Amino acid sequence: AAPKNRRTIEVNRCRRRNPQKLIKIKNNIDICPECGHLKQKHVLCGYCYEKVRQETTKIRQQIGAQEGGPFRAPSVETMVLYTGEKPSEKDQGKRIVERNIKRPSWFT
C-alpha cells in the first residue's frame, strides 16, 4: 500500500511542530563547586573526575611495574605513599606503592 496523495507541508509542519515532538528543556542542571563546571543534580563532576581517573592510571601503572607479572595479586593489604611521606609502623606488612608526585591535596 502506497500513499494515496502527497502529504502537504502544512500538515507535515504541524506534526513535527507539535509540542509532543519538540525538544524539551532541562531544569536539573547544577554547578560543580570543586571545578566550577556544570553538572546534573544526579550526575557527578567530570573536570575533577578527570584528575581522579588519570591519577588512578598513574597509580595503577606504578602498581603494574612493581608486580612485574600476571597473577601476582598480593595476599596482603596494599597502601600508596607519595614523596615526602614515610611508612609508619602500621604500614608494616602491607604492599607499599611509591608515587614520585607529592601527596595530592584532594587525596588524603
Binding site: 557527578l44 601476582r72 595476599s75 596482603v76 593489604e77 597502601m79 587525596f107
Partner: protein, 149 residues
C-alpha cells in the same frame, strides 16, 4: 512486562550472565574500583556484598573455597579475599560496596555509567557529595527551634 522481576537479563543467556558477572566480580576484586553500566553495576552489587561474607566465614570453609574458586578466575585473588578483603571488612557488618552514578559515556550510545568500588580501599577517595552545613540560614533557624525544644 517487568512486574515482580528480581533478575536482570544480561549477556546471551543465564550462563553468560553468571560468566559476565563472574568476570566483573573478578575484575572488581583485582582493582577494587570498576566503571560499568548502571544496570549491570546494580545487579552485581548484591553479589559482591555476599562474597565478602563468604570471606568472613573463614578460609577453612569448603563451600567458601569452592565459591571463591568459581567466582574468581584468577587464583592469585583467592588468598587476597581471605587475607585482604575479609580482614578489612571484619568490623563492618555490611555495605561493603559503594556504587555511584557517573556521567553517561559520550560514545554515541549514551549508556548509563556507574562506578562500583569496595569501601575501605587504598584507592583515592571518590568525589562524594557533601551535605549542607548546619551554619546555613535554614539550618540555623532549625537550630533555634531545637534549642527551644
Amino acid at each position: 512486562i517487568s512486574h515482580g522481576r528480581v533478575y536482570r537479563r544480561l549477556g546471551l543467556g543465564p550462563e553468560s550472565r553468571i560468566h559476565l558477572l563472574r568476570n566483573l566480580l573478578t575484575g572488581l576484586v583485582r582493582h577494587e574500583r570498576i566503571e560499568a553500566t548502571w544496570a549491570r553495576a546494580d545487579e552485581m552489587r548484591g553479589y559482591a556484598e555476599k562474597l565478602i561474607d563468604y570471606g568472613k566465614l573463614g578460609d577453612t570453609n569448603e563451600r567458601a573455597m569452592r565459591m571463591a574458586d568459581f567466582w574468581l578466575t584468577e587464583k592469585d585473588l583467592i588468598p587476597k579475599l581471605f587475607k585482604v578483603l575479609a580482614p578489612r571488612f571484619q568490623g563492618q557488618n555490611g555495605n561493603y560496596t559503594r556504587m555511584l552514578q557517573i556521567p553517561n559515556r559520550k560514545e554515541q550510545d549514551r549508556a548509563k555509567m556507574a562506578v562500583i568500588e569496595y569501601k575501605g580501599n587504598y584507592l583515592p577517595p571518590l568525589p562524594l557529595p557533601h551535605r549542607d552545613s548546619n551554619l546555613t540560614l535554614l539550618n540555623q533557624l532549625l537550630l533555634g527551634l531545637q534549642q527551644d525544644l
